[PDB]
Amino acid sequence: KLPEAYAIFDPLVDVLPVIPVLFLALAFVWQAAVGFR
């Protein structure tokens, strides 16, 4: 468990590791925005 003073951030920390994957997905939103140029 995190130190007590940071316990407020538990749900955020459960989600952080997935964030790199979102960059890959974000790349496809960008290419869909410019029409796969």
Binding site: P11, L12, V15, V18, L22, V29, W30, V34
Partner: peptide
């Protein structure tokens, strides 16, 4: 829940694309 934070996080990405598209930016 945790789905609240990952909603704010998951929407951050598409919003950057949206703002630049609606402002006609270097996409």
């Amino acid at each position: 829940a945790q789905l609240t934070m990952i909603a704010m996080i998951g929407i951050a990405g598409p919003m950057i694309i949206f703002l630049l598209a609606v402002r006609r930016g270097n996409l």
